[PDB]
C-alpha cells in the first residue's frame, strides 16, 4: 500500500467541472480520496485532453479516480449508450515491463481479455530518472481499477523474486 502516481487524462472541456467554482470540487475530491489531485498544465492551446496527476495509495486512487469518472458521467462525457472511458498512465520498473507483456505477449493478452480494459506498454520508451516506463490503461472505471490492480501485483511479484 505505497504511494503511487497515476496520470488520468480527461476531456479538456471538463476541466472547469472537475475543478469547480473556486476549486471547491477538486479540493473536495482531494479530501474525500485522501490523495493529491492536481491538473497538469496544458501542452498547448488546442490539446484535446488534459492530464490529472493523482498521488496516493491504492485505496486513495480508487476514490480519486472513481469520483472523477463519476463527475464526468454527470457531465455527459461518454458516448451514446456507453460508459465513461478514460486513459490512465502508471509507472512500472523498466525491468518488469517484459513481465507485464509476458512470453509472446500472452500475459497482456489475457489481462485485457479478463478486464475488458486495453493495456498497452508503448514501444521504444526511454526509462525515466527512476528507470520506470509507462503502461497505458484505457477502459471504464471498474475495468481500469482491475487492470491497475493486477499490473501492480505483477510488479510486486517480480520484486518479491530476488
Residue numbers in the entry: 425 to 586
Publication excerpt:
In mammals, there are three IMP family members (ZBP1, IMP2, and IMP3). Each protein contains six canonical RNA-binding domains, two RNA recognition motif (RRM) domains and four hnRNP K homology (KH) domains. These RNA-binding domains are arranged into three pairs (RRM12, KH12, and KH34). In vivo functional studies as well as in vitro work suggested that KH34 domains are responsible for RNA recognition.
Similar to ZBP1KH34, we found that the individual KH3 and KH4 domains of IMP2 adopted the type 1 KH fold (βααββα) and were also arranged in an anti-parallel pseudo-dimer orientation. The overall structures of IMP2KH34 and ZBP1KH34 are almost identical (RMSD of 0.5 Å for all Cα atoms). We observed that IMP2KH34 had lower affinity to the ß-actin C28 zipcode RNA (Kd = 161 nM) compared with ZBP1KH34 (Kd = 15 nM). From the last round of selection, we identified a bipartite RNA element that included a 5′ CA element, CU-CA-C, followed by ten nucleotides and then a variable 3′ GG element, (A/U)-GG-(A/U). We found that the 5′ CA and the 3′ GG RNA element were bound specifically by the KH3 and KH4 protein domain, respectively. We hypothesized that the highly conserved GXXG motifs mediate phosphate backbone interactions and that the variable loops functioned to recognize specific nucleobases. To determine if the variable loops mediate differences in RNA-binding between ZBP1KH34 and IMP2KH34 we generated a chimeric protein where amino acids present near both variable loops of IMP2KH34 were exchanged with the corresponding amino acids present in the same position on ZBP1KH34 variable loops. We found that this exchange converted IMP2 into a ZBP1 like binding protein, which bound to the ß-actin zipcode, the ZBP1 RNA-binding element. We observed that only four amino acid mutations in the KH3 domain were necessary to allow IMP2 to bind to the ß-actin zipcode with nearly equal affinity to ZBP1KH34.
